[model samples]
Target: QPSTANGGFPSVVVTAVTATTSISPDIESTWKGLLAGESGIHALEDEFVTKWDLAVKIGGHLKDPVDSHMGRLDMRRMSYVQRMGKLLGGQLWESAGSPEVDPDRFAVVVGTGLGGAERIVESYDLMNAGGPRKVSPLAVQMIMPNGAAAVIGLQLGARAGVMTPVSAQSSGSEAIAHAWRQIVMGDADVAVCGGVEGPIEALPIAAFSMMRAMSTRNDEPERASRPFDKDRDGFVFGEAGALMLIETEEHAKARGAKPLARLLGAGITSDAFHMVAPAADGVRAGRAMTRSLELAGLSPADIDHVNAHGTATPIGDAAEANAIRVAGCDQAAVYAPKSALGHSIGAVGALESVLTVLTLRDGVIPPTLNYETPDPEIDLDVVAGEPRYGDYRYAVNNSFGFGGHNVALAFGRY
Candidate 1:
């Protein structure tokens, strides 16, 4: 039995996971696409983009609309984020074999960077163009940031608690961390947790373009998001939803649930620095890694690979590399999935966490696409071109947000 610093509570484990992203509809397909070094990014040909004349016109937009897989009556009042959340939550539960757990002991925590922004904008436009009567009566419910959690909890009959954490890009990982805390604290025996973002619209693209935070490689969408590469400019925005069903080891055993990986520990920290920029030194980020290791009862040497939060930003990548070195995990091979998946913001953390679990379960690290030229500053060993396989024991997933939020999750092979 493995001992953790969780107040003597049973360890929490991820039993099942699922994802829907621009790259693929399900986790299995997504993993295959990633291992094949495929990219979902492409030129944005939306009417809004052409009308607004946005400088950056590439993103990882979903190929299929959510309505195609959902019922009209059920989705009539739901926003894109809400639809995505409900879809992923149900998929995760089904993937977990629909375990029978106490309704009072079940929980839900779904995170998002900008919840229902599209709905809010559309409502505002309707009222501005016509009148307040033109807006839908259910617009308020759809625009709430907790809308996703509310829908999922109601669907699952979860009475333990439904929570929504909005921490920009770190939202997804924080959601997972919060679920782990709930189980360890005996607040819940099971939780459905993850992150979701949906429908890359014109507003966000225009805003990020003004900030110069997005890539301008409009000609080659496949090679636009190049993390750790010397010629990298900026990240390519993406949208995705990923969810997992987690429970205490004892609860899982009692229910005969097969866990994919053990979520050993989690560390969360704040830089107290800039809003959109990471602390150049990465001291606080490194502290988060160290704290996670300590809670997991492991050392730097135990980590065989790192799923980095390499967003392809100039400062963010360098700061993260420095943080990895500061945490003494630079010796571990690093793979940046954003190179292929693009930056999904709030959903990236949860999506990458799923990939990390797969990496440990299969002992294969997927290649970082578009890593043509290595940056001298980021001297870490990055797996590129092809997948690297090994007998891995433990791995760490990093998530950093625009508001100086840092979260590190440590996972062990089950």
Candidate 2:
């Protein structure tokens, strides 16, 4: 009765999903672009690039730049990241139909990787250029890694708890997984959760380039992020903000809210191997996928498709390729969103999760852009060039991050 046959946990349902990126302004536009195979990457035009002779000059910069200080009530005091958090997070809250629920029963989880790096650098530069008193007065508050969730929680009047989990690229998906546990454990009835990033600047780009983590295909900006392709060099560093609203099934039904998708199960693991490199063996990564299937009471055959964490890197893709095989889901159709969306760091997990949800809801898997030359090592069925339609019931989103973070989330069609 009520699916208690599996476990005593309550059913968790996603009510709404919303996102914003430089690729396209709104969620619907991003969805259209995803299916059409559009890329948002462009050559960085900052004066610092030419001044410093930067090697990696291309990125998925926002189509329209928001001011350092947005015109709003006291919001001008917030830094650029905070501004994006307010705008995107606020939009997500409203888009979720502004659920009316107990404040004490609501929660929030918004995460970021390298949060407020731009502001931190700016303040440090000012301090070095002109001694002690040069830094802004709001530096301390603006530089907090929890700034996005904190602000969004305040906006939504949530009293249960507000959290920020920063686990590199897996940050966003981890947030979703955390929210799922919250509802299943009865910690909260409703949660506003996701990830956001605003690290597009000279310093971060230079740092990523130094690590050889970014692509240098500056001539053809759109084709640079070729995930799973033989000629793929590296990911195009990008920035994006995304959020989803999830609640327990009983709570959603009580409010007459329609379900977008069901959060069936989640699995997480760490390689504990290296800070920068993924585990070559992919044991932990494979474990995450298997655990998720077990938790969902499903098998590898139940997964219809995969939203891969393909950042267009050499080692990263190979490791994940083996992990998917290790999980015994080699038959599932895989699509990599980063090929078009340009790897939005912490935001990639949440952004791709939204895409996965949409894929299940619409019964259409978006094509992976720039998948012309297939790598012999990657043997799975990679969907490319055009959209593929089918009646699918279940899908999984995989997110692996630096510091060996790995998370797999299973979503079922509602």
Candidate 3:
């Protein structure tokens, strides 16, 4: 019984959205960088980068990211993550034609893998190198993961539920999930939501490297974060804020919003399997998909593409690939943008979803960049080498986090 008025749901509608990545346009130059089997993973030999020693030496670290094209005065008044969030949120709002909707009518939900690594690192460095007196009084405001959401919300005058979900790599995806739940219950009319990070700093790098999660390929920065590769070792570190405007179709129609895509359903679950390792069975992740399909009233066959959550880790990639296969989503054309943007722990989910929607809009699917040696283990028609035109009417995005949280969303083209 699909509701005739608004795609069967009365709560959430995906009005519009935008993404802000941390990589340099030059380093991430070609879509070929993604398809010809290249990895955004690069070597960093800086004295600071030297402190961390994970041999594979790979990650999608954004090079000299600007918070926005905004004025320096505005930049000076804002925190990096907040500036990113507000900038991205503003983009979505303005993209919505800068609607006149009441601020109280909308909410904000943002997520981050690491809150404000850059600020925290800089503050600590200042204190250690310059003394406690050198520490800025604004340390607490800058380092918190929720900083982006709060600052962005204030910018838009949104007094509704401004939130930040910090569930590791899957944080961004989880924020969307949480947002959907609110709309489902008739909580708000519109929401600015996504993920962000400013983690090109010390503690995060040190922690990840200590956990053996980073690659140590210092000489070659690219080709480090290789997902599903036979010799793939670990995940890359990247930063960004990716967000979407979610509302009801009726709400969008009432506002004369140009429809971009439809969020049919969202499915989320937890593996509780391991701190890092995904379960070999993939039962939890597979179940999440099954529930999502039911919510969307669609089958696996309707899926034309999949923006996979392949973090390029040897074990994680194999596990997720197996999960997709077991869930009957294996046949969908798969694209891993991490090859280009790097693995944006918290931001990738929203970033990939944005890419997925654009792929459908362009009616073409880009290939997975930089796939050199395909290990016989992973099997799928992973579009590689070039952008292939496709009839991608529906795309399913998947993201799983460290704490066994599994989330999937069903989206269809308008």
Candidate 4:
């Protein structure tokens, strides 16, 4: 049996996982690229560049756009978030062997940071340019925040429940945690859960640029995102949709399913001191990690790696490093995927969780790219330059959002 064996309170197992991102067309390729310390952020050729006069000219824009497999006629009527969710959900289901489970025993959760922002912006533009008649008849359904989850539910025929968690960057991780809770609490036998972000449009880019939260390295787009590096200016926006199919051990084994890894524990906390900035004291963030370890019946020494929520920002990395220090996991090999994949806001958490699960499965730690000249404030063991191989038993994935939301998920070798 694995270290944290069995499907129980903290040991919820993942049957299958997948993702599509700016970094790669699919999750396996994305994992390979990340392990090799590659960057996905590149120059944007859209008109929004000149429209916004954006200081940040580079972003982790999707190389391959979402293809929902819905015919052109059907896709023309759906929003980008819905399309991406549908595509992601379909791929995840297929990856999970298209398990034959009761509709009432399955559920879906889709997390997003700025849900339906692009559709809303487009609708506003249409209203201003051509009045009410120009707006699409499906405007209301397309612009709703819960559109992704709702559409996924209808597509999957999941009658158990459909939910959306919207906690900015932590939304995706929270979705996973929520799904874990539902299964542990006996609400469902299987959960299709993950996060998605389609906020690559003009308004969101302009807004984030205005807040000075995005990188302005137009000259060197690939090297722009440098998480935990001294030269890191800020994060670059990225788009992604990643999902995992989680099921109980008993349920999975009965159906002849193999688990990739066991979800050992999960912890969620808030700083409450600031709306956009993480609490400088690291008290709450540390508590979240401690609580996760306690839930998993683990010690700090048991944690072999951490998928850090390093967004290439100045303060965020320090706060997380301090939090890890406080939690006694500072020595663990930490890899910041944002260094290679950029930050996908609500979607990055789940994507990082996917990477963490892959790491546990493969016994390798992907490196954080562009980590030269490390920030003196962060002295933890950051896996940089190249990948490291280790027989890790357990790992933690961290995600911190704008509203001081912090989520830590513990995964064990299975």
Evaluated with lDDT, which candidate comes out highest? 1
Clashes of 2: 0
TM-score result, candidate 3: 0.87
State the C-alpha lDDT per candidate: 0.88, 0.84, 0.72, 0.85
Q: How high is each candidate's TM-score?
A: 0.96, 0.95, 0.87, 0.95
List CA RMSD, all candidates: 1.8, 2.1, 3.5, 2.4
Per residue, candidate 1 scores C-alpha lDDT tens digits across 370-394 of: 8988899999899998999999889
Best TM-score among the predictions, by candidate number: 1
Model 3 accuracy (lDDT, Cα): 0.72
Error of 1 at 10 (Å): 1.8
lDDT score, candidate 4, position 176: 90
Give the poorly placed runs of model 4, Cα more than 4 Å off. Answer: 1-10, 67-70, 127-135
Instruction: Report the Cα lDDT for candidate 2.
Output: 0.84
> Could you tell me which 10 consecutive residues in candidate 4 have the lowest summed lDDT?
1-10
Question: 6-48, model 3: which lDDT tens digit per residue?
Answer: 3566635577767655444332233334434444455554455
Model 2 lDDT tens row, 1-414 = 223118666878888888877676678888888888777878888888898898988887766554533687545467666777777766776877777789999999877886666668889899999987989888887888988788888888889889899999999999998888777777899998888887577777877889987889999988898888988898897768788998988999999888988888889999999999999887899889887787777889889988899999999999899999989877899999888878788888999888889998889998888999888999878999899999988888999999999999999888
TM-score of 1: 0.96
Candidate 2 clashing pairs? none
When sorted by lDDT, best at the front, the candidate numbers are 1, 4, 2, 3
